[PDB]
Amino acid sequence: ERSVVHSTFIIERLYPAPPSKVFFALGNADAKRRWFTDPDNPMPGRFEMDFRVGGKEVNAGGPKDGPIHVYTATYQDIVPDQRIVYSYDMLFGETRISVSLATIQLFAEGEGTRLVLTEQGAFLDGHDTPSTREHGTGVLLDLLDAFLDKTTLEH
Amino acid sequence: ERSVVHSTFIIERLYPAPPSKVFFALGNADAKRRWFTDPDNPMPGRFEMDFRVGGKEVNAGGPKDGPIHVYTATYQDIVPDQRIVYSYDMLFGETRISVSLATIQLFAEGEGTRLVLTEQGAFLDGHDTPSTREHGTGVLLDLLDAFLDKTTLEH
C-alpha cells in the first residue's frame, strides 16, 4: 500500500568556528570523510563526494548486522562559505525510504557560525518518519560539532 | 545578498480519466511533449524525457523576448500508475531561481483520478516566490486537464 508523508524541519546550531571553517568541513572530501559516518558502524571506505553542482555524494552505514543504509546526495546549488543545497535519497537494503531536499545556510554569529539546516522530506510508504529523520539529522550535526572542536586543536 | 525562502504547496485536481491514463500523460515522452509547454512560447523541440529513476527531463520556455527559462528534472521514485517523485531546478537565463522536490500521487476517484501534487521548494535569493510558483503549477495542471480531454476524443 502506497503513501507519502511530507514534512519540513529546521535545525539551527551555533559553532564557534567562522563560516569558512564550517563550510570546509562540509565541502572538503578528506575532511567530511573523517566525521560524516555512522559511529556504531563506520564505513568511510564507502564515502565519496564530488562537491560541485551536479556532483554526487555517497555514504553508507546502518546496523552492523544490516541491512546496509545508503545515502546518496546530488548537489543542486553551492555558494562558497554560504549555502549548500542538495537532494538526497535513503535506501535501507534495496528499499527506498525517502527523498529529501536539504538546504544548509551559514551566517556569521559573532566570530563563529549560525548554521541553519532545512530538510523538506518525502517519506515513502511508511518506511521512515519525520520525527526519526529529524532526530538522526540532529545526531549528524552533533558529529559536525565534535569534528569542528577537534579540528580547531590541530597544528 | 543571499537568502532562501522554503515553502510547500499542495494542488489537488480531479480528472475524469482513470489513473492509468493520467499516468500515461505524465510518463510517456511523446504524449507529454504535446502538452507540457509554454503556450505563449512553445519549445517542444527542446523537450526531452527519460522516464525512469535517475532519468532526466528538460523543457524550455519563458518570454518570447527571453531570457530562456529552463526546467530540469531528475526522477527520484516512480510507482506505475500511482506515484512520481522528481527534483527540479529552474533557470531564467544563466541564473538558478529555485530547486524543488515534487511529488505526484494518483488516487482513484470514481471512474477517474484525484491527482495530488506537492511541491517543496527552495527559492533562491529572492528570484522567485512561493505564490508565483503555485500559480504557475496550477496553469500547468490546467494544460494537463485540456490534454486529457482532447486525448480522450481520439480514435
Residues whose CB falls within 8 Å of the CB of residue B129, separated by 6 or more in sequence, listed in order: B5, B123
Secondary structure element (H or E) that encloses residue A128, with its range: none
Question: What are the chain B neighbours of A83 within 8 Å (beta carbons)?
Answer: 2, 4
Q: Which three cell numbers stand for residue B95?
A: 541564473
The sheet carrying A56-61 orders its strands as A4-15, A112-124, A95-109, A83-92, A69-79, A56-61, A48-49
E-only strand ranges, B62-94: 69-79, 83-92
Cα B109 to Cα A107: distance, rounded to the nearest angstrom: 47
Burial of B64 (0-12, 13-18, 19+ CB in 10 A): exposed
Residues whose CB falls within 8 Å of the CB of residue A23, separated by 6 or more in sequence, listed in order: A80, A81, A82, A84, A106
> How far, CA to CA in Å, does A12 sit from each of A2, A86, A117?
33, 17, 6
Chain B residue closest in CA terms to A90: B76
Closest CA to A127 of A80, A83, A69: A69
For residues A79 and A86, the answer to whether their CB atoms sit within 8 Å is no
**Where are the domains positioned within chain A?**
1-155
Chain A residue closest in CA terms to B118: A6
Question: What are the chain B neighbours of A122 within 8 Å (beta carbons)?
Answer: 77, 85, 101, 103, 118, 120
Cross-chain residue pair B120–A120, CB shorter than 8 Å: yes
Asked: is A1-155 a CATH 3.30.530.20 domain? The reply is yes
Find the largest Cα–Cα distance for chain A: 55
Test the A interface: residue of B77, B97, B105 with most A CBs within 10 Å: B77
Cross-chain residue pair A83–B120, CB shorter than 8 Å: no
Cross-chain residue pair A2–B82, CB shorter than 8 Å: yes
Closest CA to A77 of B98, B53, B23, B74: B98
Residues whose CB falls within 8 Å of the CB of residue B154, separated by 6 or more in sequence, listed in order: none
For residues A123 and A98, the answer to whether their CB atoms sit within 8 Å is yes
Check whether the bond before A67 is cis (ω within 30° of 0): yes
Cross-chain residue pair B124–A77, CB shorter than 8 Å: yes
B108, β-bridge pairs: B113
Test the B interface: residue of A78, A85, A97 with most B CBs within 10 Å: A85
Resolution of the experimental structure, in angstroms: 1.5
Chain A residue closest in CA terms to B102: A122
Phi, psi for A17 (deg, rounded to 5): -75, 150
Cα B104 to Cα B23: distance, rounded to the nearest angstrom: 10
Chain A residue closest in CA terms to B97: A77
Nearest CB to B6: which of A4, A77, A103? A103
Secondary structure element (H or E) that encloses residue B63, with its range: none
> How far, CA to CA in Å, does A16 sit from each of A63, A145, A151?
32, 9, 12
DSSP helix/strand/coil, A53: coil
Radius of gyration in angstroms for the set of CA atoms belonging to chain B, rounded to a whole number: 15
For residues B64 and B41, the answer to whether their CB atoms sit within 8 Å is yes
CB atoms within 10 A of CB B1: 4
For residues B14 and B109, the answer to whether their CB atoms sit within 8 Å is yes
Test the A interface: residue of B8, B91, B120, B125 with most A CBs within 10 Å: B120
DSSP letter string over B47-59? Answer: -EE--STT-EEEE
